Each structure stands twice: as C-alpha cells, then as structure tokens.
Amino acid sequence: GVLTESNKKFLPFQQFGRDIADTTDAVRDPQTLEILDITPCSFGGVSVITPGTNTSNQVAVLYQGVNCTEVPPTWRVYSTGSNVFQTRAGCLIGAEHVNNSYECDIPIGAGICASYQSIIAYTMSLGAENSVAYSNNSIAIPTNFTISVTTEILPVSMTKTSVDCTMYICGDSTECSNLLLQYGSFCTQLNRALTGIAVEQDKNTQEVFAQVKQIYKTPPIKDFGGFNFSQILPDPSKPSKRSFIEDLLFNKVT
Amino acid sequence: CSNLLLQYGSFCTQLNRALTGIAVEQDKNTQEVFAQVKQIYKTPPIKDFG
Amino acid sequence: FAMQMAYRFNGIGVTQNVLYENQKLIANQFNSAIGKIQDSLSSTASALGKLQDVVNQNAQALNTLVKQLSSNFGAISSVLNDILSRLDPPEAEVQIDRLITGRLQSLQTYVTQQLIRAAEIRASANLAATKMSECVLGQSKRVDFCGKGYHLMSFPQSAPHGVVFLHVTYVPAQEKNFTTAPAICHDGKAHFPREGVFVSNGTHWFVTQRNFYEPQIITTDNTFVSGNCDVVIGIVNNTVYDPLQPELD
Amino acid sequence: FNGLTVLPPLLTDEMIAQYTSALLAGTITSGWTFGAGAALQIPFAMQMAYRFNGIGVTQNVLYENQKLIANQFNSAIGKIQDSLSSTASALGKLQDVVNQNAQALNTLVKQLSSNFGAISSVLNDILSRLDPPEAEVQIDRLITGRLQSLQTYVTQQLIRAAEIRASANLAATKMSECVLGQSKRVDFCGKGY
Amino acid sequence: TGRLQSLQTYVTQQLIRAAEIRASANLAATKMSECVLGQSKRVDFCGKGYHLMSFPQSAPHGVVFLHVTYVPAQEKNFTTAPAICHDGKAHFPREGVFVS
Ligand SMILES: *[C@@H]1O[C@H](CO)[C@@H](O[C@@H]2O[C@H](CO)[C@@H](O)[C@H](O)[C@H]2NC(C)=O)[C@H](O)[C@H]1NC(C)=O
Ligand SMILES: *[C@@H]1O[C@H](CO)[C@@H](O[C@@H]2O[C@H](CO)[C@@H](O)[C@H](O)[C@H]2NC(C)=O)[C@H](O)[C@H]1NC(C)=O
Ligand SMILES: *[C@@H]1O[C@H](CO)[C@@H](O[C@@H]2O[C@H](CO)[C@@H](O)[C@H](O)[C@H]2NC(C)=O)[C@H](O)[C@H]1NC(C)=O
Ligand SMILES: *[C@@H]1O[C@H](CO)[C@@H](O[C@@H]2O[C@H](CO)[C@@H](O)[C@H](O)[C@H]2NC(C)=O)[C@H](O)[C@H]1NC(C)=O
Ligand SMILES: *[C@@H]1O[C@H](CO)[C@@H](O[C@@H]2O[C@H](CO)[C@@H](O)[C@H](O)[C@H]2NC(C)=O)[C@H](O)[C@H]1NC(C)=O
Ligand SMILES: *[C@@H]1O[C@H](CO)[C@@H](O)[C@H](O)[C@H]1NC(C)=O
Ligand SMILES: *[C@@H]1O[C@H](CO)[C@@H](O)[C@H](O)[C@H]1NC(C)=O
Ligand SMILES: *[C@@H]1O[C@H](CO)[C@@H](O)[C@H](O)[C@H]1NC(C)=O
Ligand SMILES: *[C@@H]1O[C@H](CO)[C@@H](O)[C@H](O)[C@H]1NC(C)=O
Ligand SMILES: *[C@@H]1O[C@H](CO)[C@@H](O)[C@H](O)[C@H]1NC(C)=O
C-alpha cells in the first residue's frame, strides 16, 4: 500500500487499527512510534473504445477510476505525452475533447461519450430545444396528415437444447457413473429443469400465434379500395408460401 | 494463487460477462423510462394557466 | 376495406368524411410506407438485432459449457480414459472425484443461467401475445403501445424466432395557428361546442373538429347552451345562426 | 476494497431532471398532442375541458367551476409537499434496493475473512509461514470457498436485476400512458377517474 | 459441502419459482382492477368477445374470474354504400351504417 501521516489519534496501548473485515487502515512503526495510515494504491479496469477494425485501427483507452496526475501491457503511445482527458468515469487517452456536443454512438459514462469523426469525446446531447408558443387564446390545429408504418421485433422462443447430465460428466465410464451415483439426484433435477424450459418454448409460440379459430383465406380478386397488400400477403410461388417481407426477415437472420 | 486458479477454467469470464450485462441493462432501463421526448420543450416565461 | 378504415378514423377521433374525401392520397401514402419498410429491411443491416442477441447468447453459453469439459480441476489430466488407462482404481478415484465436482459445478451454472434467460424470454413472449391480441385483433387507445402516433391497425409477420409487427398510425401534419375562445355569447347565453373547438381566422368564428381543420358556421345544431355569460372566463361575442328561421320565413 | 469497483451511470442526474422538465413543460403547454406528433399549443383551461369530456363530464362543469378546481388542485399539490417533507418512510421502495445491494456487497466482503478449513484466512500469511508444496493444499480450499461465495453473489444479482427490469418496464408503460395521454384503465393511473 | 450445495440449489430454485408466482399475482391484481372494478376495452384481456363484467371467486392458492361477454350471432348479408346523394350533396351516417 501507500503510507500517509495519519490524523486519527491512538490510545497509548493499541498497535494498529481496522474499519471493516480486518482491513488494516492504520499502524504504528516499531521504532519512531508514529501513527501511520495504510490505503491501497490505485487500481482499475481498462477499456478500449475502437470504432471497429473495419474503418480505422485507431483506438482510445479508458482507465476507470484513475486520476490523470499519476498513470505510469506497455502501451507506449499512451503514456508519453499524448492528449489526455479526465472525466468523472476515469481518464481518457487517445481522444480529443471537442467543445461541441451532439448525439453520440459509444457511451463512456457520466454523460461523456465518444464517436469517430480522429476520435472525439464530448458531452451527450439530450435533444433539440424548442419553445412552444403558448398563449391563453391561441391554438394549433392540423390541416393535413401523414400515415406512418413502423416495425417492432419481439423474440418469442429460443432453441430447445437438452444436456444429458450423466454422459456429460462421465461419458461412457462405469467407474465414473458409480462414483457419481453417490451424489444423490442432481442429474434428475437438471434434466427436469431443461425439459421444462424446452416445453415452455413450444408453449410460448402456441400462445403467441395460435389465436385464430379458423384458417381464413383471402379472396382471389384483390380490390381493397387502392390499398396494396401484395408484399405482406403470402406468395404462392415460394415453396414455403412465405411473403416477401417474411422471406427478407428469414434471410437476414442466420 | 493465480497459477492454481487457472486450473478452474473460464468461470470468471462468465462472472464478468454477467456483471457487465447487468450494468448495461441498468442504463437501458433508465433510457427507456425517461428518454421519451424528441425535443426539449420549455415552458413560457409568463405563467398564465387559468 | 374503405369502410373499415372509416370506422378506424372514427375511432381515433377523426370524422369518417376525411377518409372518403382523401381515399386516393391515403392509399398512396400507405403503399409508399410499405415500400419504404421493404427497402429498409432489404438494405439496412443489424435491424433484427434483438432476435440475433438471443441466439448469440445461447450459442456462447453452450460453447462455454463444452469448453469447460477440458479443464484439469486439479487432477493429473482432463481425460477420464487416460486416468483409467494408467492408474489403479484406489488412486484413480481421487483423480476422478475432482473432475466430477468441476463438471457438476459447471453444468449447474449453465442450467441456472438458462433458467434466468428462459424467464426473460417468457416475459417477452407474453408481451408479444398481448400485442397480438390488442393491436392486431382490434384497435387500441393505449398510448405508444402499438406504435408512435394514433394507432389505426397492425399486421403480424413471422420471424425465425419471433414476431414482427407493422403498426399503421395516423400522424397529424401541417399545423396552423388560430385564435380560440371557450364559449360564444348570444342573447345573453353561453354556447359550447358539442364536439369540437371554436376557432377564429382573424375576423370570423367557426367550429372545427379537434384533429382536422374543417371550419363550419356556428349553429344551434353543433352547439349546446347552458347558463349566462357572467360565469365563464374568456367568453367572446358572436351570433349563433339557427336554420329554423330561414325556412320558417 | 478488493476488486470492487462502481461504474457511474451514463445519464447524469442533471440530464434526467432535464428530461422530466421537458415532459412536464410539454404536457402543460400541449396536452397529449406532443406525444403523437408535433406539439400543438392549447390553453390549459381547454385541455382540462377536453379531459373532463374524456372522463364523461361535460366541459360545461369545468368552466362553471374553474376557480374551485384550481384551488382544489393547488391545495392537493401543497399537501403533497407537506406529506413528503413531514412524513418519513414514504420512499421505502427506493430504499429497499439500496439496502439490499449494500447488504449483499457487505456479505461478499465479509466472506473474505473465513478460513474455509484452511490454516488462515490471509493468503500472504499462508505463503510466508509454509513451503510451496504444502501451501497449495490450503490455497485450494481458499479458492473453493471464495469461488462459491462469488458465484452466489452473481446469481443473486442476476435474480434481482430481473425484478428491477420488470419494475422499469412498468414505469416506462406508466410514463407512456399516464403522462403522454389520458388512460381509461381502472386504477392504472392513480385512484379515481 | 454436499448438504450445503443441495440447500443452495433448493434456495435458488425457490427464488426462480417465486419470481414467476409474483408475475402471475401482478397479472391477477391488474385483471381484478380492470375487469371487476370496471369495464375494459382491451381485446381478449377478460374473456373472448365484448366484455361486459367479471366476478371474482376465491381459490385455495389463486383466484377464479368469471368473465361475462357479448357475442354476436345469426349474421345476415346486406349491401352497403359509403354515402348517399340527395340534392347534389353527400350524406354520411352519424353513428351507423347504410344497408340495403
Ligand atoms: C397533404 O399532404 C400531401 C402529401 O403529404 C399533399 O399531396 C402532395 O401535394 C403536392 C402539391 O400539389 C404534390 O406535388 C404531391 O405530388 C402530392 N403528393 C401526393 C402523395 O399526393 C397534399 O396536397 C396536402 N394537402 C393539403 C391540403 O395541403
Ligand atoms: C402492389 O405492389 C406490387 C409491388 O410494387 C406491384 O407489383 C409490381 O407491378 C409493377 C407493374 O406491373 C412491376 O413492374 C413490378 O415488377 C411488380 N413488382 C412485384 C414485386 O411483383 C403490384 O402491381 C401492386 N398492385 C397493384 C394492384 O398495382
Ligand atoms: C401563430 O403561432 C406561431 C407558432 O407556430 C407563431 O410563430 C412563432 O411565435 C412565437 C411566439 O412566442 C415566436 O417566438 C416565434 O419566433 C414565432 N415563429 C416564427 C417562425 O416567427 C406566430 O407568431 C403566431 N401568429 C399569430 C398571429 O398568432
Ligand atoms: C376568414 O374567413 C372568412 C370566411 O371564409 C373570410 O371571409 C370571406 O372570404 C372570402 C374569400 O375566400 C370572400 O369571398 C368573402 O366575401 C368573405 N366574406 C364572407 C364569406 O362573408 C375572411 O376573408 C377570412 N379572413 C382572413 C383569411 O383573414
Ligand atoms: C357582448 O355584448 C354585450 C351586450 O351587447 C356587452 O355587454 C355590455 O358590456 C359593457 C362593458 O362595459 C357594459 O358597459 C354594458 O352595460 C353591457 N351591456 C350592454 C347592453 O351594452 C359585452 O361587454 C360584450 N362582450 C364583450 C367581451 O365586450
Ligand atoms: C529506537 O532508537 C532510536 C535511536 O537509536 C530512537 O530515536 C527511537 O526513539 C527508538 N525507538 C524506540 C521505540 O525505542
Ligand atoms: C465496413 O467496410 C465497408 C467497406 O469495406 C465500409 O463501406 C463500411 O462503412 C465499414 N463499416 C464499418 C462499421 O466500419
Ligand atoms: C487528481 O489529483 C490532483 C492533485 O491533488 C487533484 O487536484 C485532482 O482533483 C485529482 N483528480 C480528481 C478527479 O480528483
Ligand atoms: C389572456 O392574457 C392576456 C395577457 O396577455 C390578458 O390581457 C387577457 O385578459 C387574458 N384572457 C383570458 C381569457 O385569460
Ligand atoms: C353472403 O353471400 C355469400 C355469397 O352469396 C355466401 O357465401 C355467404 O354465406 C352469405 N352470408 C350469409 C351470412 O348468408
């Protein structure tokens, strides 16, 4: 640790001190008989803020909870005089601080976040500011309209996987199986839980989709007042009878 | 201690991954709850609300 | 389908007249929106990230479970066949026990994390079922539940491990500023709009529906009268024309 | 602490206050119109008349009784201040999360002071007092105990985070429906109409 | 160590199950509030059909809701028009539909 001149006073009979869970926070030297306090030297995690290997190979390194004053796995270019920015989430090296502020891509913390223009760091922007013209005898009324179509994606189920407890641990060994038998019924509980998850997976799909009493079929002559549902409706040409949008969705996810 | 700990496989990779997932989830929760405005509206200087 | 859309327009608070007098424009806007959705799905990637994250997490967990099978756990080797091949059972049992303990611990961790993930997926599936019931099988007044705007109708689409909802909404546009008053005074009586709001274009006063600008002359038919002029704050003076008198003449 | 770090939140409290201010200014000056699209201004009395129409009472009643309604609203919001300032334990739900997290972290710290069957709980003491061949026996017990404690902590944190996410989803739905509009769901937005 | 591991497994499983039970209880409370103390427009939230009213009944560890709904029956075929013309003007129903 790092020693410092302690301020707290000891009664003439103690030798050291602690606060919680045997964490020795103080000690007196056996020769000068001076009360010193002990605190650990700084440590923390390291993060990389690359914008992707594709585009550029430039990176920014963040040391979390470390003061900029003291810093020096060598990282030669990052401890010799490069531009260093100190934030509330740590110290940032390799990203210049811009006085502007706007919507960003990569969060850092404490309202500071970074993006690739070089790499810059700046305060997050919540949004644009407008002052609505409020008055006690004024109203705004629409004179037109627009129709918007938006997409919402919701996962309903995952793959049904089953793991054999006995064969995973032992794998065709009679001695291993005999030794494992002494452990009780852990394997039975694990298999039961996995099968329960597997059944819940089918129950989820049944709850989500099976909500029609009958299989309704669209008429051949499609005259819906001008509204065109060709892409949404199933395509008989495709063997799977999926629509255009469904085909695109299935192609994207693999 | 670390050399002996290496014999236990990648347990702590899982531990750190779970904790980082929780940490990201907290920010997602806050952002979903509060950030629901396109623009930062401001009240007029004159307060005459009836 | 046009009559259904008129019913939905009534549902969101807009008179069904507007649909019939703007049917072609509405159809064109819907077709263009569908085309834009198709283009965005075809070109833009990572849109289906929520579906991909679940698959990635499950694959990573399973890969970790498989790779944890190659750990010594303090034993001489991670292969049971090697231990049994070169050791007598009395000392081989000690080596096998450590491997058994390690593998059991790893499998238990896997099962617990899978249970947590399954609970999350079940919650998501329940939300999807509720959205299917309330946004597709009907029209919902819940704000932002079935898209941003005034909900009209939704279309479900199947996904590899999920469901995709296309929410059609009515969004007002091209607003204009007017002068408004709460009530109109005629013959010492306070007149209120039956369904709408009084507006002025500078010199005259009209009645419009609240979501679309359709000015109309203030009459007894589209207003109701209650009380004198003194109580209401913000009254203005105007005439309320009654259709009965011209026909009576 | 020993490897225990706390990550600051991405959104500082000033930004969250700004978001709430934007929400509140928008709902005062526009009603529910800013939720659907662009913010359309409306006199606050007319918005109240619209909401009375929404709950089933004609807008006549608001205008005939505007001063009384304003006084009642002001008195109620003043009583809110009085109750918050004077009475305590109103925020027990928020305090429970902090207490639970602090207690879990404290027990995680205190599990570092247990022998777990070894000769000591101090690893440096074991190293200094004992030769390498025998030190591994104690170190393995220490590793087993500390791994088990850490795994228990992580599992409990995941289970708690699930509940916090459920609460956050409910809060987001209430912000969307109670604040950006007028809801007809019974007891979803307070008690009454 | 064996018995303590078994106990830890039991406690973790109980916590996971209690989370699901709490979710079900929250759903039941919401259903009571929105269907016994009121009438809900949400589709398929309280029964199948057009909801009228609900009645709660106690169960040993749960609740039973009796949902009363309105179901149309005996439909008939007709002919419609979006509007009707008279004296060179377009007429639309106030709250109904034109049939022939
Ligand atoms: C309402 O908006 C629509 C488009 O959002 C307007 O239609 C456009 O009008 C311009 C001007 O005549 C044309 O150049 C475009 O081709 C039209 N687009 C479409 C899709 O028809 C419409 O005129 C607006 N109505 C009012 C009353 O402002
Ligand atoms: C509904 O939209 C589809 C897709 O835009 C239309 O099909 C297109 O029609 C044009 C002209 O006949 C062709 O050039 C395209 O190749 C067609 N695309 C596809 C994917 O088939 C369809 O005509 C529209 N419906 C109506 C009634 O016009
Ligand atoms: C009608 O309303 C519009 C708002 O859409 C007014 O335009 C803004 O009015 C505010 C009043 O505080 C000004 O601060 C803005 O600068 C105005 N915007 C622009 C672009 O000038 C408009 O003045 C109003 N007009 C009338 C006659 O009421
Ligand atoms: C406000 O609206 C009224 C009624 O629409 C306008 O008065 C009429 O304007 C038309 C022009 O479109 C003239 O032909 C009529 O002679 C006007 N008087 C009537 C119908 O009695 C008035 O000009 C509008 N004021 C504005 C736009 O500032
Ligand atoms: C609407 O018209 C009535 C009567 O036509 C106005 O009532 C007069 O208000 C003035 C205000 O000083 C009084 O001096 C008169 O005695 C009232 N009666 C008459 C018969 O003139 C009323 O003020 C008008 N509304 C507004 C907003 O001016
Ligand atoms: C140890 O001796 C030094 C000088 O030899 C003296 O300055 C110091 O006070 C002594 N400390 C104790 C604890 O005797
Ligand atoms: C990836 O590389 C392609 C070209 O190789 C480029 O067009 C694209 O912008 C890159 N994307 C990122 C995120 O770097
Ligand atoms: C870093 O140390 C200096 C020297 O005392 C101090 O002034 C500064 O506030 C410290 N930085 C932080 C973030 O506390
Ligand atoms: C509206 O505010 C103006 C001040 O700008 C005031 O003169 C007028 O009396 C007010 N009218 C109402 C109805 O509050
Ligand atoms: C309406 O007419 C169609 C075609 O004539 C027929 O298929 C359908 O069953 C009829 N509906 C009823 C309710 O009779």
Side-chain angles (χ1 to χ4, degrees), chain C residues 142 148 180-181 193 197 226, chain D residues 35 46 50 53 59-60 177 185:
Chain C
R142 300 174 56 188
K148 184 174 174 66
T180 180
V197 58
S226 166
Chain D
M46 293 180 183
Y50 285 18
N53 274 323
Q59 65 183 177
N60 188 179
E177 299 184 9
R185 298 173 47 178

Side-chain angles (χ1 to χ4, degrees), chain A residues 126-131 134, chain B residues 38-42 44 48-49:
Chain A
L126 295 197
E129 290 183 353
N130 74 311
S131 179
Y134 177 80
Chain B
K38 299 183 290 293
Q39 314 198 4
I40 305 295
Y41 305 103
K42 299 187 295 292
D48 47 355
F49 300 126

Side-chain angles (χ1 to χ4, degrees), chain D residues 29-47:
Chain D
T29 55
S30 299
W32 55 70
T33 62
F34 79 113
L40 306 177
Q41 75 257 11
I42 191 66
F44 191 78
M46 293 180 183
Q47 172 184 176

Side-chain angles (χ1 to χ4, degrees), chain D residues 72-85:
Chain D
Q72 288 174 343
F73 174 83
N74 296 351
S75 286
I77 197 164
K79 294 171 189 309
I80 287 311
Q81 171 191 357
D82 299 343
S83 164
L84 274 178
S85 172

Side-chain angles (χ1 to χ4, degrees), chain A residues 62-115:
Chain A
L62 167 72
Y63 297 96
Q64 303 169 327
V66 171
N67 197 345
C68 165
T69 54
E70 58 94 19
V71 164
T74 72
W75 315 143
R76 316 159 211 73
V77 187
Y78 310 98
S79 290
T80 51
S82 174
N83 223 31
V84 174
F85 183 43
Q86 169 83 42
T87 77
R88 197 155 73 73
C91 65
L92 194 57
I93 316 162
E96 80 176 278
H97 181 73
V98 291
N99 212 352
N100 212 2
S101 69
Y102 43 102
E103 176 58 39
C104 63
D105 302 329
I106 305 166
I108 286 179
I112 298 296
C113 64
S115 84

Side-chain angles (χ1 to χ4, degrees), chain A residues 76-224:
Chain A
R76 316 159 211 73
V77 187
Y78 310 98
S79 290
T80 51
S82 174
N83 223 31
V84 174
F85 183 43
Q86 169 83 42
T87 77
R88 197 155 73 73
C91 65
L92 194 57
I93 316 162
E96 80 176 278
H97 181 73
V98 291
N99 212 352
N100 212 2
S101 69
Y102 43 102
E103 176 58 39
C104 63
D105 302 329
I106 305 166
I108 286 179
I112 298 296
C113 64
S115 84
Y116 186 83
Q117 65 97 32
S118 177
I119 293 165
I120 62 169
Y122 48 88
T123 296
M124 209 199 309
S125 173
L126 295 197
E129 290 183 353
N130 74 311
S131 179
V132 60
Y134 177 80
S135 180
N136 60 347
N137 55 5
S138 66
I139 193 173
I141 293 183
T143 70
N144 209 351
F145 50 82
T146 56
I147 297 169
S148 174
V149 171
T150 53
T151 58
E152 202 187 351
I153 297 90
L154 277 167
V156 306
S157 86
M158 50 177 197
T159 50
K160 302 157 68 185
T161 182
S162 174
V163 181
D164 192 14
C165 175
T166 295
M167 184 177 177
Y168 171 77
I169 298 151
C170 288
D172 195 0
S173 162
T174 48
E175 185 79 75
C176 176
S177 199
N178 288 335
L179 293 189
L180 183 63
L181 270 192
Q182 308 173 354
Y183 274 77
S185 68
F186 287 130
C187 286
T188 289
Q189 310 174 1
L190 296 195
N191 295 332
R192 202 208 329 269
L194 284 175
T195 56
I197 297 153
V199 177
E200 212 165 51
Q201 297 319 293
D202 281 327
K203 184 176 180 180
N204 287 351
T205 295
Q206 278 271 336
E207 280 180 4
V208 173
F209 288 100
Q211 289 184 358
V212 290
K213 308 179 320 273
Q214 319 181 5
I215 300 302
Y216 299 113
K217 197 181 163 184
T218 190
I221 174 164
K222 301 188 159 45
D223 195 12
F224 304 119

Side-chain angles (χ1 to χ4, degrees), chain C residues 98 105 109 112 116 120 142-144 148-150 175 177 180-182 192-193 196-197 210 226 231-233, chain D residues 32 35-36 38 40-41 43 46 50 53 59-60 63-64 66-67 140 151 155 159 165 173 176-177 180-181 185:
Chain C
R98 315 191 63 89
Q105 210 189 33
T109 297
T112 302
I116 304 298
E120 188 177 358
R142 300 174 56 188
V143 183
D144 288 334
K148 184 174 174 66
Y150 296 119
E175 66 253 40
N177 168 5
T180 180
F192 302 102
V197 58
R210 308 166 168 171
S226 166
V231 54
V232 186
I233 300 173
Chain D
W32 55 70
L40 306 177
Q41 75 257 11
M46 293 180 183
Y50 285 18
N53 274 323
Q59 65 183 177
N60 188 179
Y63 297 134
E64 286 181 340
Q66 188 170 328
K67 297 190 186 70
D140 264 336
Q151 273 169 349
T155 296
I159 293 182
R165 186 187 54 239
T173 306
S176 287
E177 299 184 9
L180 309 177
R185 298 173 47 178

